[PDB]
Amino acid sequence: MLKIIIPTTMLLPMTWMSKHNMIWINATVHSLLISLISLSLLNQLGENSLNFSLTFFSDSLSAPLLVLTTWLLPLMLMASQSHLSKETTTRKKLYITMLILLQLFLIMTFTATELILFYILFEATLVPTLIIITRWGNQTERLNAGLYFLFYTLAGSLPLLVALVYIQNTTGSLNFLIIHYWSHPLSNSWSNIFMWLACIMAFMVKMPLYGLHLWLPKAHVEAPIAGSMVLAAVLLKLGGYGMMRITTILNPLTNYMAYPFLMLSMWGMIMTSSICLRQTDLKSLIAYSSVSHMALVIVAIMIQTPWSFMGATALMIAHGLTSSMLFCLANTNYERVHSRTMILARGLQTLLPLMATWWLVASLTNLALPPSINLIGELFIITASFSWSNITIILMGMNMMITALYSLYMLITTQRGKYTHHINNIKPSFTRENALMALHILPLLLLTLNPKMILGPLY
Amino acid sequence: AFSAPAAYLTHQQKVLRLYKRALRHLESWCVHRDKYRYFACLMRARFDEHKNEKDMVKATQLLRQAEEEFWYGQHPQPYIFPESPGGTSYERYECYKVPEWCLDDWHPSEKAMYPDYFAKREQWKRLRRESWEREVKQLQEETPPGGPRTEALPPARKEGDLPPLWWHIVTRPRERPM
Amino acid sequence: STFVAYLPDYRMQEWARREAERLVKYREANGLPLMESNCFDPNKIQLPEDED
Amino acid sequence: NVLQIVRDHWVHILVPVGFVFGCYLDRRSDEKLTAFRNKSLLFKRELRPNEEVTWK
Amino acid sequence: PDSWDKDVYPEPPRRTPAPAPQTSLPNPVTYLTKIFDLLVDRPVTLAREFIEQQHAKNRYYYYHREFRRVPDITECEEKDILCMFEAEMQWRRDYKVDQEIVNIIQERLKACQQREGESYRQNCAKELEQFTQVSKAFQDRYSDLGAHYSARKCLAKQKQRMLAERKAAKEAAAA
Amino acid sequence: IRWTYARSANIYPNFRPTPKTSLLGALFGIGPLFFWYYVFKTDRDKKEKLIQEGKLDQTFNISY
Amino acid sequence: MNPFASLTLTTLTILTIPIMMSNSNIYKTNLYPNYVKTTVSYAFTLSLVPLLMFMHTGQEMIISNWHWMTLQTVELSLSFKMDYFSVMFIPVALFVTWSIMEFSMWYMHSDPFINRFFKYLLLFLITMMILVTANNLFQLFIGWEGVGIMSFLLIGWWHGRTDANTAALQAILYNRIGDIGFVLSMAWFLTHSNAWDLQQIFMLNNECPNMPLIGLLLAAAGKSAQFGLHPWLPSAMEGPTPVSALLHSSTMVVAGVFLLIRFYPLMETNKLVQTMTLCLGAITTLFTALCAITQNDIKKIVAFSTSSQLGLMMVTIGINQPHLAFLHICMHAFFKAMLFMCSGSIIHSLNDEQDIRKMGGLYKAMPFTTTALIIGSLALTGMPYLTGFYSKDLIIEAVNMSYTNAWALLMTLIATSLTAAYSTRIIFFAFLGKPRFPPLVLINENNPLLINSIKRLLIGSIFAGFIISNNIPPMTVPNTTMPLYMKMTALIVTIMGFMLALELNNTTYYLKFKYPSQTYKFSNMLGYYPSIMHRLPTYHNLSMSQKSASSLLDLIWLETILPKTTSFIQMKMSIMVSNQKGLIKLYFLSFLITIMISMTLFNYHE
Ligand SMILES: CCCCCCCCCCCCCCCCCC(=O)OC[C@H](COP(=O)([O-])OCC(O)COP(=O)([O-])OC[C@@H](COC(=O)CCCCCCCCCCCCCCCCC)OC(=O)CCCCCCCCCCCCCCCCC)OC(=O)CCCCCCCCCCCCCCCCC
Ligand SMILES: CCCCCCCCCCCCCCCCC[C@@H](O)O[C@H](CO[C@H](O)CCCCCCCCCCCCCCC)COP(=O)(O)OCC[N+](C)(C)C
Ligand SMILES: CCCCCCCCCCCCCCCCC[C@@H](O)O[C@H](CO[C@H](O)CCCCCCCCCCCCCCC)COP(=O)(O)OCC[N+](C)(C)C
Ligand SMILES: CCCCCCCC/C=C\CCCCCCCC(=O)O[C@H](COC(=O)CCCCCCC/C=C/CCCCCCCC)COP(=O)(O)OCCN
């Protein structure tokens, strides 16, 4: 596993020893090379994971997450170099250092064998994101949003630590393999109920679960393009990965304690999908759609069936790619008009046709158009929920109806109609932005031909 | 759509608008031409019956009952011209309307084609640039200190001037841009 | 993408298929049921003392 | 002229060697987990007349 | 073909009727079939025979991997991790093999339904019975284990089923 | 800008806890959750009771 | 290997070749539409062969060529079903599409994006073929959503027009409503039958329960625009006339009826679902024709006519005659598409005018279009020995001799009369009388593309019914013994509708004017269904999305409980703790109190 970690570490002295006009080129090239190297982890087994050493291991669940995390960094560098042009060399290198540190922390988090190390890295990921949001954000709210990002997570994650060090004091180990093999049932008691709550809510906050989701429309909106990209694509999936990992020790209590969270998630799908219909901010609309999509993965993990787990993995990967592309597309318009109001700039299909095509593809993939992996994950989760309960089909389908509504609306408001007259500074799209959307969307369509690569260990 | 609106519609304008609307809806009801001519003459006689009423209260009441009768008897599916706000080709060609400033972002290879057109465009741009200050001064001097009471704009008054705020009116894309 | 497409079958899907064909042949030829209800041999299971 | 290329492009070999070094650091780790090599009940086998270890 | 086994993928003797014409009109289907054979089939078989001659010049083989039988979870001690790991791997392999057996039976059923045409309800009772038996066995073994399944959970399910059967047998013997 | 600010950022400073506001919030945020919880609990208890006595016709239900 | 499978696969394969050439130097040249039309014609000619093979020996096949994946005991593979339905509908769809592209080469000659239009039509055709040839439910869903998205993109072709975007989004919404039922059926079949393909579903369901069939019926109602979800089809006329002629008239809108036909073995076992289907079809075929008999937009009249025909197809499905429904689909495609091309020709010749009130005497001004529309109206009304006679009259006679809901039969007969009623309306108001268009005459139909495209479908609408009906094997038991009065009932009601429609149309020539009645207002405003269902539920949903979901809950109370209460409590606690004047006299007394408390509470209890 060190063959991926060490080059990511070497990215730092490389960036700090590069020329003032050569940091972006070298960083992008070597991050793409690291992604190519990380592609080798997709060769998984059918019975047990890839145990590299006592500290790091890779399963079929963490391999696609690793690949996506390594792939996102070149895209973040490509999207960030536009608005950081007037920045000084030292601060450019500091921003690239923040991105590299975030990638390294995510790489170590997705492969840690022991739960305490996983928690340590999973919490260490907060610092670079907070620094990026609160230092390179554009508006005055970026400070407050930062606080919302910091204290929402910690208030959920601090009890988790108290749980973890407790478990090692009773079972003797926190290694995932030992925990899986030596699993024991959870008795129905208040102490076990609160231990279940402590081991779960830390991942519910990061999803975010409906009710504890207020930090996301702030953090995603006020963050820069790379911050929002890393927040939507990868940082939201940490909760899902941790919950899928830790639900082993929670049975059979998960049958009883999941009802409030299940109800919250199935109603939050409708609530957030309806909120998306009336949103004057485009970035806020994308952020709320992210919560609407993550509620489905919450339900899938809670119902605890193999089809649900496969659907959750596929939906996590697909949503990461789709949300990253949508945030990039919104940022392209923002860098022209310097406003996030959706109705300010209209009829952009006439002026930017290829960008309109990118918008159409992103919108179609967002609403789970078959045979995209978004649709595969959504349909697997729907079938698992229908097996869990038939009446669920009333809600999920309703959500689908709303999902296609606010998506195409978002496409109609910005791309169709007539252009606003007073705006006259809409320059043709650069090759960098078009390449960014192409690199966002081509793997998304490529993953259709090989879905088993992103279906998790339950395949 | 070119004329500046007024603060209110006088009685004469209201009656004329009602007459035109009633004639249009009658034509919608009377599909055949001769029948429409017959009933249009009947409607014109009905309107001329009170052509010289001097009691303004009585005239207003008569107009109110005429409006009520029209609203009751209007055609649910009146004929609309294709390019009218309700027609089948109202905003059909808006997707083909491109603003002219986009031509400023063309690559030099694209501007290599159509050289005479871009020379004339440069002449037009110079003409626009050379006359903006005079138009602003004319607007400042003609406008009352409180502000413009209406949206009507004054014409050019000297010899070498152009009417103020003329660029976007003159440089409209087209009615059939493609 | 080409590297991912031609990844060696480490999931043992074709191996599982081949074992399935062998077992189906054997059980159909001997007339045994194609699939057993118990995956573990009951002789190796020591159940509790009594039903009450 | 070799200096003109090396002195401003050596930062391009930090990540490459950082790759190969990592690979080496992986192999050494495999040397510390050989307590069951050719000892599992599923893969236990008689050694070839010339080989010394079933895997490195 | 010899690519697959005919005992595992059986089919009826393929009775077909000989052409018996009644009218003197030409058959367009025969003319089009001759055109397809002369224009499409012959170049394809020529290219394939060339490819086969090329393949025969380089003959190398690949082998089916054989796995030994290791003790199951029933013979492992409570906290003995090594035999537990080996038994769990063997159980996962057996689970995959059972899945593929169910897949083969389902393929038989699908081929039956398509082949028999309008008499599929009567001529495919054997396939339906085989699928019902295999599905019942698979449901008894692996159903309701859920995610995070293991050999221990399957053993517990089998023990519970065996207790239920023993109680039912004792109740029946009392009559 | 005024429209967007009023629709997004000016709402909470102009919010006061009132009986109407409290009742509407409690209803629209709490009632649906317990209604759906009751519906799903009733359906799942019925299904589990049917399973326990073994009358559901769960044949061919391999995938879940 | 027999050529059947190879030809069937190649017919679908060669349609995708012009799509791959969309980035080549043929897409930027004015020869692309002719290239696509030639490709479609060649595909139709290739597809003609498997149809001949089936007519010879009744040969059917399924080809499972590419194994997509395997989820435990479920295997998903790329499989195509080449039964009677596929091998019969593919040539008809290809022929209609070829004629439609030939017509569009003339209709959309002045459009700057004609190449994109033709490639969009080809993409829709590919999606429709995927829908028809699908063997499993996942591939069928792929084709379903493909044709839905293509319809969305083609309705809003003029994206600068608000009404086109509104109609496209409305169609998407109405189709998603039935997509809910489609997903319900897919989930039920996966859970209970452990399969998504048709073979295992048919094997494992001897008596299909209510829920999957209800989901399939909901999906079919959504796709075919039945009474519950009808209004999207009439409003889909905002798009170009070729889009209306190809997608929303003959080929795409029959997808729900086709889906119900594909699952007919399961529908034969459930009486309740058949009754529901019959009632829905009857109410749709009545209501749509009742709305049509007063419309002024010609495209709207044809849209309501095709919706009524779809309702008749659903009624036919409801009486357990799926093959009759498929035969009626195949027959309806021809004359409905050619009627739409005639309407488009009139619109183009009258300077993009669609209101029939401004169309006068075109009987002699447009002889070819006039004769084509006359033949089409005769075929649609069930004139004997035309194309529509071999399907519609048999449908009526089958409903007349079945254990049927009496109201459904009565509404079907009334709809049969109203069909002739609105055909008379169209003919009388578009071709008879005196001209009512602007005097600058632009009427010109002497274009070889238009003439040939209309003439091919005219020959179809004349002879295809007899050609097909005599070449398919019998799929049902005929109704050979009928009373004379009930054998001619379809003809009697069609004739009677003809006479009353002609009489009430000639009534308009009198010099009498009177205000409309409430029945006419109900009929003309589409039963007030769009005026109510597009305003009340939409307003309530969009108001609740902001008043409660966004403002009351997200922006106020969720903030009030967790973060704002925490901030307020911490601020108050900090203010209380840090508000000390710094006088030793106070906190030394506090030290004294603390010392006493520690000596008493803790030290005295050891
Ligand atoms: C074979 C044995 C069977 C023999 C049967 C006996 C012989 C035939 C029986 C006669 C049946 C009717 C025939 C006359 C057609 C009517 C034409 C007409 O002028 O009507 C005048 C008038 C409309 O004329 P208008 O407004 O002055 O015209 C304006 C301009 O002309 C505007 O000019 P325009 O250019 O726009 O044109 C407007 C349009 C006309 O505009 C309209 O839309 C009005 C016409 C309505 C047609 C409705 C016919 C069928 C309706 C079925 C409804 C089912 C139940 C629905 C009730 C829901 C209750 C809420 O004109 C046309 O395009 C042609 C009209 C269609 C003629 C062809 C119709 C033939 C099919 C019907 C007869 C059935 C024969 C086959 C049966 C075989 C069965 C064995 O409508 C009526 O007053 C009568 C309508 C008939 C049904 C309405 C029933 C009363 C409604 C309220 C009842 C109380 C409800 C209390 C509450 C209950 C709550 C539970
Ligand atoms: C906005 C979203 C934020 C996140 C929301 C998270 C939701 C947390 C809720 C936890 C779900 C279950 C917790 C406890 C399980 C049952 C709770 C209770 O209602 O059940 C009864 C419990 O009985 C009584 O109700 C005792 C609880 C009453 C006191 C608790 C206060 C509940 C008020 C709601 C507080 C709001 C929660 C969120 C705080 C911010 C069952 O009766 P009994 O058979 O005897 O007990 C069985 C449990 N045993 C086995 C451990 C003994
Ligand atoms: C611009 C103009 C557009 C129109 C013109 C286009 C011209 C045509 C080109 C389009 C081709 C159409 C595709 C038709 C399908 C054929 C390809 C298919 O056969 O290959 C698949 C193979 O595809 C691969 O499986 C998928 C590639 C993996 C995608 C990964 C993306 C690259 C990494 C980037 C990182 C991004 C993050 C990802 C997070 C997980 C089949 O999978 P498989 O059944 O096995 O193969 C069987 C044989 N094997 C096993 C011996 C190999
Ligand atoms: C952004 C908001 C997120 C909120 C996160 C906070 C919720 C976490 C839930 C409470 C965490 C406390 C659990 C600590 C770890 C449990 C480990 C454990 O099992 O210990 C139990 C003990 O469990 C406890 O003591 C925990 C009691 C709770 C103390 C702190 C109260 C905090 C509030 C609890 C209720 C709120 C929970 C939901 C919060 C909703 C937020 C919206 C048993 O220990 P023994 O003494 O050995 O008993 C067996 C031998 N007789």
Side-chain angles (χ1 to χ4, degrees), chain E residues 110-127:
Chain E
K110 285 128 94 194
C112 211
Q113 205 271 355
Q114 168 65 21
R115 191 195 314 115
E116 288 310 316
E118 306 286 323
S119 325
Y120 72 101
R121 185 50 73 207
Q122 164 174 22
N123 298 153
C124 290
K126 289 270 136 283
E127 280 70 21

Side-chain angles (χ1 to χ4, degrees), chain G residues 290 293-294 411 414 417 421 425 496 500 504 517 519-520 523:
Chain G
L290 193 124
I293 62 186
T294 63
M411 302 346 287
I414 297 172
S417 276
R425 180 187 184 66
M496 280 179 0
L500 301 108
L504 292 133
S517 46
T519 315
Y520 171 84
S523 172

Side-chain angles (χ1 to χ4, degrees), chain A residues 152 155-156 159 162-163 166 191 194-195 197-198 201 205 212, chain G residues 562:
Chain A
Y152 254 95
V162 185
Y166 170 80
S191 297
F194 278 103
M195 185 225 81
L197 276 172
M201 281 267 246
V205 173
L212 317 173
Chain G
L562 189 32

Side-chain angles (χ1 to χ4, degrees), chain B residues 32 35 69 75 77 87, chain G residues 161 296 357 508 510 512 515:
Chain B
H32 310 282
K35 179 173 171 158
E69 175 194 353
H75 201 312
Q77 205 167 79
Chain G
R161 170 169 156 94
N296 294 291
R357 286 173 286 203
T508 71
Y510 310 148
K512 321 167 152 122
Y515 287 147

Side-chain angles (χ1 to χ4, degrees), chain G residues 211-355:
Chain G
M211 179 144 60
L213 291 197
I214 291 186
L216 286 175
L217 175 59
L218 178 57
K223 208 57 163 186
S224 293
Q226 300 301 278
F227 173 72
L229 316 152
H230 64 291
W232 77 266
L233 212 157
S235 87
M237 296 309 131
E238 303 274 332
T241 298
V243 175
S244 305
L246 178 57
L247 278 79
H248 312 110
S249 82
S250 67
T251 279
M252 197 224 62
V253 287
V254 304
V257 185
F258 192 86
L259 172 79
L260 290 192
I261 286 163
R262 271 265 183 252
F263 282 90
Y264 84 83
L266 307 190
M267 275 258 201
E268 291 180 349
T269 75
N270 206 297
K271 217 49 68 204
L272 176 75
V273 186
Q274 295 183 278
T275 303
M276 275 154 119
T277 315
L278 167 78
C279 290
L280 184 72
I283 190 178
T284 305
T285 194
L286 171 82
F287 185 81
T288 40
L290 193 124
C291 295
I293 62 186
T294 63
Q295 292 317 301
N296 294 291
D297 189 19
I298 179 164
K299 288 184 81 183
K300 285 260 190 313
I301 302 172
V302 194
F304 281 110
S305 174
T306 197
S307 188
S308 171
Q309 299 296 290
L310 292 162
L312 186 75
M313 287 160 206
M314 214 81 112
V315 149
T316 291
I317 275 278
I319 64 167
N320 197 28
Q321 308 278 350
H323 300 264
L324 261 191
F326 177 76
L327 200 65
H328 187 53
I329 284 175
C330 291
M331 251 60 99
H332 173 253
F334 283 102
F335 58 81
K336 196 46 66 87
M338 149 215 88
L339 280 169
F340 253 126
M341 281 175 300
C342 299
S343 322
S345 172
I346 300 176
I347 291 162
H348 190 282
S349 306
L350 280 190
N351 195 259
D352 286 319
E353 166 74 2
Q354 303 187 5
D355 201 311

